[PDB]
Structure 1
Amino acid sequence: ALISKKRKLVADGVFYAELNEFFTRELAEEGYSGVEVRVTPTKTEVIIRATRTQDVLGENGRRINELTLLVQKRFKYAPGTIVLYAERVQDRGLSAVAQAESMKFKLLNGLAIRRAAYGVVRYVMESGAKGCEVVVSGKLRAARAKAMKFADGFLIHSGQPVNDFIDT
């Protein structure tokens, strides 16, 4: 123990940072969408905001066992001072992170560029959205670089409401 609060709080952001990274790399085939860490007495808690907790759970309670053990071994928690809890999310149509990895999972699954983008926007919109946007930057087949935009409905682009309403 014994760490300046500064170095404590900073380190806690780095903690989360590395955490979400690892989850983002390990639970993509489940539309994983983020994490929150609950510090308590007796235990340190971790919630796995994903869309698909029946795969994260695993047969009679494995994989979550594996993910714990993993995360435990790394940050060197004593078996039982860390707890991992999977959780469905509320309609994945309003998480930027869920749809991006869906698009990823559209074109990686061999589909038209406009069918992927437009279908995604029609779901997110259908999910009670004020507005939705998708930018595809890169190169498909054609040699020369290109990019596309795919907006719908209402969004603002500036100011604090950004810190209030849009997810990027």
Structure 2
Amino acid sequence: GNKIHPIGFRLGITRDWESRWYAGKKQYRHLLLEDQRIRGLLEKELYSAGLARVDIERAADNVAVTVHVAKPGVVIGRGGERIRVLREELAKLTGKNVALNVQEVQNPNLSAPLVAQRVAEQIERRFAVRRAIKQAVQRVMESGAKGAKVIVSGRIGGAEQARTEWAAQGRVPLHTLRANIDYGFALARTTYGVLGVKAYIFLGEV
């Protein structure tokens, strides 16, 4: 066992770094700390809208935050009020005239993080784990997505002993570099402890 991170395995090719910028040794750690703070705040705030990806880049004492969301209306709010207040909050955090951007992920069934968080939400609502997993894999499989796989950790349905569920369908070649596999993790907090949800999606080759 002990599979390594399917993204970290493909950082060079078929994937890209979430944070893209440069800093010397003198001023590296500070930028990273700021970046982590931004990510934390965004995860905390925009969770309702269905966040899937946060991109940060720097040009010259600037921040260009791009948020990939299933539902962009929630983020924008009415008359661009919520986006504006969020921008204000981020700029107050760090005086770097941040430039927030919002993108809508096409076919939100094809993003692994969204699938993972959905399954975690379902588990939090005392659903049936196996049936939910089967349905999720089915929905992923419907709209292309040559491969799909969903794993739920353990402590199923408030049991005493943990166990893994694993429903999958199609081709999921974790051993191939030119795979373009999209991966998503989620944590479901219930009254009987925590559960881990992992989702793998396989979108063609090359």
TM-score of the two chains, using structure 1 as the length reference: 0.81
| Code of the aligned partner of 1:145 | A
Q: Does 1:149 align with 2:166?
A: yes
Structure 1, unpaired ranges of 5+: none
User: How many residues of Structure 1 are paired with residues of Structure 2 in the alignment?
Assistant: 161
Separation (CA, whole Å) in 1 of partners of 2:37 and 2:30: 10
Identity within the alignment, %: 27
Gaps (5+ residues) in structure 2? 1-21, 184-206
- More contact order relative to length (CA 8 Å, sep ≥ 6): 2
Tell whether 2:84 aligns with 1:84: no
Question: How far, CA to CA, are the matches of 1:12 and 1:96 in structure 2?
Answer: 28
Task: State the partner residue of 1:52.
Answer: 71
Give CA-to-partner distance per residue, 1:25-75, whole Å, 9 cap, x none: 322222111122344569532221111111111222222122212211212
Deviation, 1:150, is 1.0
RMSD: 2.5
AA aligned to 1:28 is Y
Aligned match of 1:115: 131
Structure 2 residue identity aligned to 1:98: L
CA distance, structure 2, for counterparts of residue 109 and residue 4 of structure 1? 44
24-33 or 41-50: bigger deviation: 41-50
The one-letter amino acid of 1:165's match is: N
Match of 2:11 in 1: none
Structure 2 SS opposite 1:167 = strand
**Structure with the largest fraction of helix:** 1
Q: Is the 8 A contact 1:31 1:102 kept in 2?
A: no
Matches within 5 A, 1:35-74: 35-40=54-59, 44-74=63-93
Whether the 8 Å CA contact 1:106–1:116 is kept in 2: the answer is: yes
